[PDB]
Amino acid sequence: LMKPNIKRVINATGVVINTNLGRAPLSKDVINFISEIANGYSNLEYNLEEGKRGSRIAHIEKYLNELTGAESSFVVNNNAGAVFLVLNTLAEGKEVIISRGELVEIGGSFRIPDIMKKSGAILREVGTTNKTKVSDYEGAINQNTALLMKVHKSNFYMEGFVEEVKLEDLVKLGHKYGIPTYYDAGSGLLINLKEFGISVDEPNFRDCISLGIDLVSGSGDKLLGGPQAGIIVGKKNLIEKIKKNPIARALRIDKLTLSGLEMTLKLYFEKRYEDIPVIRMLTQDEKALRQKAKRLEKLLKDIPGLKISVIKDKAKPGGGSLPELELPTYCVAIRHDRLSSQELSRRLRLAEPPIVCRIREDQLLFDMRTVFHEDLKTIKKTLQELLSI
Amino acid sequence: MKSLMKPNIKRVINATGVVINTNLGRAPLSKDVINFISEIANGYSNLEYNLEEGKRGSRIAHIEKYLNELTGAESSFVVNNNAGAVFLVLNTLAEGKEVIISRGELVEIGGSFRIPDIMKKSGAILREVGTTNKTKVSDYEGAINQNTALLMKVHKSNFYMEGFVEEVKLEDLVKLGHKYGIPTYYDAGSGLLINLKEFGISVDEPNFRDCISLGIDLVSGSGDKLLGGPQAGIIVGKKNLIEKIKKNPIARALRIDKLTLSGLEMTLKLYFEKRYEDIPVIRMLTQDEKALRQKAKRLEKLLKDIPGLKISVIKDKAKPGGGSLPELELPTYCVAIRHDRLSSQELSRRLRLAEPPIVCRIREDQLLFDMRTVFHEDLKTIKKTLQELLSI
Ligand SMILES: [K+]
Ligand SMILES: [Pt+2]
Ligand SMILES: [Pt+2]
């Protein structure tokens, strides 16, 4: 093979946070900065003022602190690690209370009880799958309770007869017994969504911090729309213990992500949301989508055996973050006389660049939500090369 | 006390359009059944007797024949309620032993019923496997050991999950159980008797016959849910196991009453006779869309003459099963009413205080009557009830 296996793939699934397709894409502004810091040497671990070594995370935490309002903050390889670290540091040998309904598998390799076991912490599971009350948490408190933990169900959701302990209650319960409260938000949403005209209950750092939760973690590649990372924020007392754990060194973030992260956080401090693609995509205007949808169909009419439509559909745009959410978008629907849709999808994934699309009832769909403007021309040229042969 | 001069349990007209309603008494009974119940209650009977042999007999006997035939299990048994069945199954086969179950199937149904809580009081030992959202065969098999007494699956009747989710195919469980020689218990909960797709309602909901022929060793369910009968815990399965269960002294504490046994038998006989329309819970879920409309405009016809009354007829998607089919979404015709003098919040409040009461849905200060759960004899009574409240 002359070719590298890692390829740019055209996402037509209309799924913005896609665990399979590389999660959050990055803004050209961020990547340029990353590219700059990677092209030569730098002040990675250095103080230019004093002429000696300095802490790498230092640059970042300041932003996090003022953005989230938490006393201190830290960042490690990924949220998986965040969880592992937080547990291993605070709960080794001791008991961590958690709802039977928040023991989650995210991805293929991550399971709360599995990482938790490996951490050295002792799982104490309370309540039921579908309903969990405050009593259940309190009931399970004892001498060896180190931690009150909540995990946000980022990849799935429950409906029907359902209950859940209000975080406030959890903070309350924590304060009573003097037990720290750890919240794995996971989506790493930085700020309240309702500020962008998207009304959702999705917990963010800032808000769940000001709720009095002692520790909150999340990924950087999800709702934060940054590079992969485990983000931790909370009580300085705690973060301090965390940083000091030798394991934290094995979880230490790389130069690239660090740079990538800091640029991302600058954008947020400067309130330039449109400049982080996950946010832009999820707040894209319903008109902007039809405008894109029709723009593509204009390029598709001239090719043979091709049936082009454009529909309006309720999709669930956030894959690994906002599972409940349903938003309307415009899909460009296409069909060929000679080829079944399943056969076409298969060829599209094998194309260069590959094209991954949603199928509905033997009707091949491209959801514009997650398609770029530079992608359109490339789908034309890629469709004709397969079908005009 | 003053409120003692009259009974508190009253008939109540349900306009919530919610067929299986935990609050409003669950499944109503057909008059055929009620008559039969009334007949066996009115005097003495063969309850525990063998008229052939002139000596005492099992009460369950009457019923077991029907269940065994309908579901295709070797033997069957009936206790007070499904909670009890679950309690009894576990206390019989798993006391002091381990029961493997998915972390996603540890349910709270009702306020007072929690699998892990009752399983504990059961004497059984809970070995929970997998995760909330995803559970694989691996999880089940990996937790098997010397003290493993049971592989258990509980059907999520009152809630459901969406997103990244995994579940073990029943077939694989059975295959896993046959491998290690461990019995498999399915708490269906819904006690649905026959496949729903036969009535034009396409859903995955498990039924007795189908889950038995798949090689599950024990299946239980409620009587007053999708079975459309009176309250009961129904167990069907392998004779060797039913036997062990029947002999548990606790099963006498859970022994069913003359009334439900009667009601149950007639209910089942209706199933044998394939007269589904004569069991309200199935009739109400299988009602034709036209029929609902037909019924909705026949109501509107009666209410036009009432002063201050604005009346429309809408078409809406509702969720008819409360405690059995939470996913199921079905279209129905509601009859919507509005008054100029009374707020709908105040009008609903008065309707519940009526004789007979009337419970309906409220949506943005508009009052909804869902035709799904309204009987034909109830229309007239809604007219007379409204005019009495509004005119007076
Ligand atoms: K890294
Ligand atoms: Pt009283
Ligand atoms: Pt009195």
Side-chain angles (χ1 to χ4, degrees):
Chain A
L1 311 186
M2 294 308 296
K3 300 294 185 177
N5 297 281
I6 309 178
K7 330 186 194 169
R8 193 209 274 300
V9 165
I10 280 168
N11 173 14
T13 72
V15 176
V16 169
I17 304 301
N18 190 326
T19 42
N20 301 310
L21 294 176
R23 285 180 176 157
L26 300 189
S27 70
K28 188 185 159 181
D29 278 312
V30 162
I31 318 170
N32 274 341
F33 176 72
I34 298 170
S35 197
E36 179 189 326
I37 306 310
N39 193 226
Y41 301 71
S42 52
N43 50 339
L44 191 48
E45 292 156 70
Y46 199 61
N47 181 269
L48 293 150
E49 164 78 2
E50 307 282 350
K52 53 167 155 287
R53 221 170 49 69
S55 56
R56 47 169 61 204
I57 307 296
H59 314 135
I60 308 289
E61 61 176 4
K62 312 181 164 181
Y63 285 73
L64 295 176
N65 298 323
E66 284 204 28
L67 277 169
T68 65
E71 292 170 0
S72 198
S73 45
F74 196 23
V75 166
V76 284
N77 169 68
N78 64 9
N79 194 36
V83 169
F84 182 73
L85 206 50
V86 174
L87 284 182
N88 180 283
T89 294
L90 302 186
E92 169 153 68
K94 297 189 76 186
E95 273 174 15
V96 182
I97 305 162
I98 183 181
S99 166
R100 285 203 205 280
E102 319 187 312
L103 307 181
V104 293
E105 162 168 318
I106 74 100
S109 81
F110 192 87
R111 289 175 133 206
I112 298 284
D114 283 356
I115 302 299
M116 172 149 32
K117 173 171 275 176
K118 264 305 197 178
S119 78
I122 289 167
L123 166 65
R124 197 157 204 81
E125 33 203 17
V126 318
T128 67
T129 292
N130 64 312
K131 289 174 150 190
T132 294
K133 319 171 172 47
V134 162
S135 60
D136 297 342
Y137 287 73
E138 187 166 15
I141 298 161
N142 57 42
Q143 321 182 316
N144 308 18
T145 297
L147 200 63
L148 291 193
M149 174 166 172
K150 175 143 188 145
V151 187
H152 177 65
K153 332 183 192 49
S154 65
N155 47 349
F156 73 100
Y157 64 92
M158 291 180 307
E159 284 170 347
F161 278 51
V162 170
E163 283 160 13
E164 159 178 322
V165 168
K166 204 182 162 206
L167 283 175
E168 289 88 314
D169 306 328
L170 271 190
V171 187
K172 163 188 200 142
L173 210 59
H175 281 309
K176 173 173 188 169
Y177 294 80
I179 298 170
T181 57
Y182 173 26
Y183 192 51
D184 169 1
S187 59
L189 173 62
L190 183 59
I191 295 181
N192 193 318
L193 285 169
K194 311 152 191 189
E195 294 186 349
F196 303 98
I198 293 184
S199 56
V200 287
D201 292 346
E202 198 70 12
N204 57 84
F205 281 101
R206 198 198 295 270
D207 292 341
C208 288
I209 277 316
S210 52
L211 300 188
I213 303 178
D214 307 311
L215 274 173
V216 163
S217 84
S219 314
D221 46 349
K222 286 160 176 182
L223 278 202
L224 176 72
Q228 172 185 305
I231 292 177
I232 310 191
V233 301
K235 309 295 207 166
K236 187 191 191 75
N237 175 20
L238 295 180
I239 311 286
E240 200 53 272
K241 294 194 190 150
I242 285 170
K243 297 198 195 198
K244 292 173 176 176
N245 176 320
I247 286 185
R249 161 72 159 97
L251 297 192
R252 159 155 114 176
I253 57 178
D254 81 288
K255 189 175 60 172
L256 314 190
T257 52
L258 187 46
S259 277
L261 211 63
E262 190 174 0
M263 189 55 191
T264 305
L265 296 169
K266 168 171 184 272
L267 300 210
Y268 273 85
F269 175 53
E270 304 176 340
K271 305 218 197 119
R272 305 162 48 170
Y273 310 121
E274 66 175 69
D275 290 13
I276 75 176
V278 165
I279 298 297
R280 163 189 88 217
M281 291 198 169
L282 282 177
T283 72
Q284 204 164 101
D285 206 335
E286 189 163 331
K287 60 181 78 192
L289 298 172
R290 179 180 63 266
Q291 185 166 324
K292 289 181 82 141
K294 295 289 209 169
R295 180 183 175 195
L296 181 58
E297 87 165 1
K298 172 167 195 49
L299 303 179
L300 296 172
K301 287 184 208 167
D302 70 346
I303 307 188
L306 295 188
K307 306 176 169 183
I308 309 295
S309 181
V310 169
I311 63 170
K312 161 173 173 121
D313 215 24
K314 307 173 71 179
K316 320 196 134 183
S321 60
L322 292 175
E324 274 210 68
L325 183 54
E326 200 128 20
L327 285 182
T329 67
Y330 297 101
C331 309
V332 161
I334 76 185
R335 174 183 188 171
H336 203 256
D337 56 8
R338 296 170 290 211
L339 307 173
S340 48
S341 51
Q342 294 72 8
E343 171 52 43
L344 195 54
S345 286
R346 160 162 70 198
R347 280 207 199 165
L348 296 161
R349 311 194 300 280
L350 177 55
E352 269 144 39
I355 314 194
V356 168
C357 22
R358 190 171 76 195
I359 295 181
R360 255 156 56 96
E361 286 72 5
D362 211 27
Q363 202 188 28
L364 196 54
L365 299 178
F366 299 66
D367 190 354
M368 280 328 94
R369 173 92 77 185
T370 71
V371 174
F372 296 65
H373 309 72
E374 50 280 19
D375 283 337
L376 301 174
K377 290 193 179 188
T378 64
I379 316 166
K380 187 157 187 175
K381 174 183 179 174
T382 47
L383 273 165
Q384 68 200 16
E385 199 35 77
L386 291 177
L387 306 168
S388 286
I389 189 174
Chain B
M1 282 221 185
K2 301 169 177 184
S3 61
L4 286 193
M5 290 172 85
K6 189 177 172 194
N8 197 304
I9 299 285
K10 34 212 151 208
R11 205 189 79 264
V12 140
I13 287 174
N14 164 21
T16 52
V18 174
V19 183
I20 304 278
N21 185 329
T22 59
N23 297 326
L24 304 189
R26 273 176 199 176
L29 298 178
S30 39
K31 201 173 173 207
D32 275 333
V33 179
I34 316 176
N35 294 335
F36 180 59
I37 293 176
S38 179
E39 178 177 6
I40 311 303
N42 197 253
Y44 295 99
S45 22
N46 48 325
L47 191 45
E48 304 180 2
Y49 211 54
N50 203 326
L51 283 172
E52 288 292 352
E53 305 194 354
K55 289 181 181 176
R56 205 173 68 78
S58 175
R59 58 178 60 187
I60 313 302
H62 315 92
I63 282 309
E64 55 155 10
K65 311 160 184 172
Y66 291 63
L67 288 175
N68 294 334
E69 296 192 292
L70 284 154
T71 67
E74 305 176 350
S75 183
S76 56
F77 191 54
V78 178
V79 288
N80 184 34
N81 59 36
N82 196 38
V86 179
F87 176 73
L88 196 72
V89 166
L90 299 173
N91 167 282
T92 297
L93 319 178
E95 168 151 68
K97 280 189 140 198
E98 303 201 344
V99 172
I100 300 161
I101 185 187
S102 162
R103 274 172 208 278
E105 277 144 54
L106 306 167
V107 321
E108 179 174 356
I109 74 91
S112 43
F113 179 91
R114 282 165 143 200
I115 302 297
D117 284 37
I118 206 182
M119 166 160 39
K120 190 173 177 222
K121 264 290 175 188
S122 142
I125 288 173
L126 155 64
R127 201 79 165 52
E128 34 227 339
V129 313
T131 73
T132 309
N133 55 310
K134 297 179 184 160
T135 293
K136 326 198 185 292
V137 190
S138 320
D139 301 294
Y140 279 108
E141 190 185 332
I144 299 180
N145 72 63
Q146 296 281 307
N147 329 293
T148 284
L150 196 50
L151 291 192
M152 185 185 186
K153 192 161 179 42
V154 167
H155 187 24
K156 306 170 277 277
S157 45
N158 62 331
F159 72 105
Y160 73 105
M161 310 185 303
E162 265 169 37
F164 278 79
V165 177
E166 187 145 6
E167 145 190 333
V168 175
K169 208 174 284 197
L170 266 187
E171 299 77 342
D172 293 290
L173 259 205
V174 181
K175 269 193 250 136
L176 190 67
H178 281 354
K179 184 146 189 187
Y180 294 58
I182 284 148
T184 53
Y185 174 33
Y186 200 17
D187 187 4
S190 50
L192 166 54
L193 199 60
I194 70 181
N195 202 329
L196 285 178
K197 312 174 198 186
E198 289 173 31
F199 311 104
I201 314 179
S202 57
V203 182
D204 198 3
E205 185 79 350
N207 69 80
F208 274 111
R209 163 152 285 249
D210 298 338
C211 276
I212 284 306
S213 57
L214 285 188
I216 309 295
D217 290 288
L218 283 182
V219 176
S220 62
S222 300
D224 62 7
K225 287 182 186 161
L226 282 179
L227 184 154
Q231 136 161 336
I234 294 159
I235 321 179
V236 302
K238 302 277 181 169
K239 174 191 204 286
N240 61 35
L241 286 181
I242 297 294
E243 296 307 317
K244 292 190 179 177
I245 279 169
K246 268 179 187 162
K247 300 207 191 109
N248 193 328
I250 287 168
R252 170 68 182 62
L254 301 174
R255 192 171 71 169
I256 93 188
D257 73 308
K258 165 171 44 147
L259 307 156
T260 59
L261 192 51
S262 304
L264 178 50
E265 175 185 345
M266 190 62 218
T267 303
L268 290 169
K269 189 163 172 286
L270 274 162
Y271 277 109
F272 260 88
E273 298 187 26
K274 324 277 182 162
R275 300 156 61 184
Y276 301 123
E277 58 191 13
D278 257 334
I279 67 184
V281 192
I282 303 325
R283 162 170 48 101
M284 294 193 198
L285 289 161
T286 59
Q287 242 150 14
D288 302 74
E289 150 185 303
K290 311 147 129 179
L292 294 205
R293 164 157 192 180
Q294 187 33 250
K295 185 139 71 176
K297 293 206 82 86
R298 172 169 89 108
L299 190 76
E300 178 189 47
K301 196 184 195 169
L302 288 203
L303 299 183
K304 59 187 172 68
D305 310 326
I306 298 205
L309 211 61
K310 327 165 195 175
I311 295 168
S312 49
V313 187
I314 74 174
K315 173 165 136 82
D316 203 343
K317 300 155 58 202
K319 306 187 164 194
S324 75
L325 304 182
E327 293 188 307
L328 181 50
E329 193 130 41
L330 282 198
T332 180
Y333 290 104
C334 301
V335 162
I337 69 158
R338 185 174 166 178
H339 201 247
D340 50 4
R341 289 180 32 246
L342 289 182
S343 147
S344 58
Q345 289 288 157
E346 166 81 26
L347 187 46
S348 76
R349 185 188 69 86
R350 292 187 180 199
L351 285 173
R352 311 189 312 254
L353 295 205
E355 314 197 4
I358 291 187
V359 181
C360 35
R361 281 188 266 172
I362 305 128
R363 198 173 53 180
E364 184 74 39
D365 186 8
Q366 220 186 5
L367 208 67
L368 302 154
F369 282 42
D370 183 330
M371 287 310 103
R372 179 85 61 196
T373 40
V374 199
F375 304 64
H376 300 314
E377 42 285 12
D378 285 330
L379 269 64
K380 288 171 190 160
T381 315
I382 284 179
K383 197 205 176 184
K384 178 266 202 159
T385 303
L386 283 166
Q387 54 199 13
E388 278 220 1
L389 282 154
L390 293 182
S391 165
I392 206 163

